[PDB]
């Protein structure tokens, strides 16, 4: 019967234990660029410039920057299709993401390795390994460490 703004956030928007008090005085100092990937986290110490109920935890990208506002583009599901949505949030709530730091590190490794690989004219399986079947080898174990197992009785 009731579907207000902050409906059903009795715990979600609640600040975690021993984390009360204003936002960290260094979160303002992060650097943002157009095209970066960002995460949206709804903090409650700040009140204005607040995200909405559904968007807590989602991701996106930066396409709009004002004196304090940040506009992020998000894919929100509705029944049969996905439609872009632009949400304007504030710096306190917004938070730099990690969804692309893995790929950035991979690109840096590629740049600093395949350069010398090409210099030597070597081909590598630069695709991610996804280790599957282990190889077959020989191992040692003395008979003094083999501890048998047997099912246990009842009590």
């Amino acid at each position: 019967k009731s579907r207000g703004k902050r409906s059903g956030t009795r715990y979600k928007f609640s600040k975690k234990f021993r984390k009360h008090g204003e936002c960290t005085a260094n979160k303002y100092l992060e650097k943002l660029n157009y095209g970066d990937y960002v995460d949206i986290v709804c903090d409650s110490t700040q009140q204005k410039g607040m995200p909405f109920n559904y968007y807590h935890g989602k991701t996106g990208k930066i396409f709009h920057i004002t004196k304090r506002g940040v506009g992020v583009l998000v894919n929100k599901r509705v029944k049969h299709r996905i439609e872009q949505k632009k949400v304007c949030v504030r710096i306190e709530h917004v938070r730099k993401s990690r969804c692309n730091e893995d790929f950035l590190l991979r690109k840096i490794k590629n740049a600093e390795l395949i350069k010398e690989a090409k210099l030597k004219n070597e081909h590598i399986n630069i695709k991610r390994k996804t280790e599957g079947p282990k190889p077959a080898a020989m191992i040692k174990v003395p008979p003094s460490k083999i501890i048998t197992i047997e099912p246990l009785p009842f009590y």
Partner: peptide, 18 residues
């Protein structure tokens, strides 16, 4: 390889067939 494993005090396992 299996015969050598049984000869000594060491064990040999073959990897999955992939």
């Amino acid at each position: 390889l299996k015969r050598e494993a049984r000869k000594n005090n060491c064990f040999y396992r073959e990897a999955e067939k992939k």
